[PDB]
Amino acid sequence: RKAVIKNADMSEEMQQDAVDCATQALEKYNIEKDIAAYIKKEFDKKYNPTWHCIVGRNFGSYVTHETRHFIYFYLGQVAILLFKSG
Amino acid sequence: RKAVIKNADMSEEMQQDAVDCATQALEKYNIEKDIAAYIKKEFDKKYNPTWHCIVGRNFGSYVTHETRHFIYFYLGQVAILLFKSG
């Protein structure tokens, strides 16, 4: 599947890194929590804490994120929200 | 509906405030984003920033939260994750 980026406040290279990371997570895990945790932990390590990740087929959200550290995209059957705060 | 608290790291009084707040949000809004935004904005105001809220029928998450500022509960047909970070 190709990611559909629905809303981003993030550099193009970091957006591509987010999609690449989620692609590996989807190969490894079918449980949304595991996908989220894989992505969150990778981004903490590569881009410093503190990241938060929500993965789901049906949810809404309202969050506060550091400027340039927000992406919300569809990949396969899940929506993925990934952002930095704190 | 009575809330079912699934996981909390939060004072009993704040947990009850979270449930009371979500109850008002569910009366006012049917869109998950609006429910989330109502709760997040109320908690920013009452308990200081920075709160984040996810409301959904089907999602997983992995987040980092300040100690004693995390609750995850079911209310009606939605799961609600509310936590403080940053």
Binding site: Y62, V63, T64, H65, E66 | K33, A37
Partner: peptide
């Protein structure tokens, strides 16, 4: 340290 508030929604 600048921030933004943002909402998301899965829509049918």
């Amino acid at each position: 340290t600048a921030t933004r508030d943002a909402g998301t929604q899965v829509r049918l």
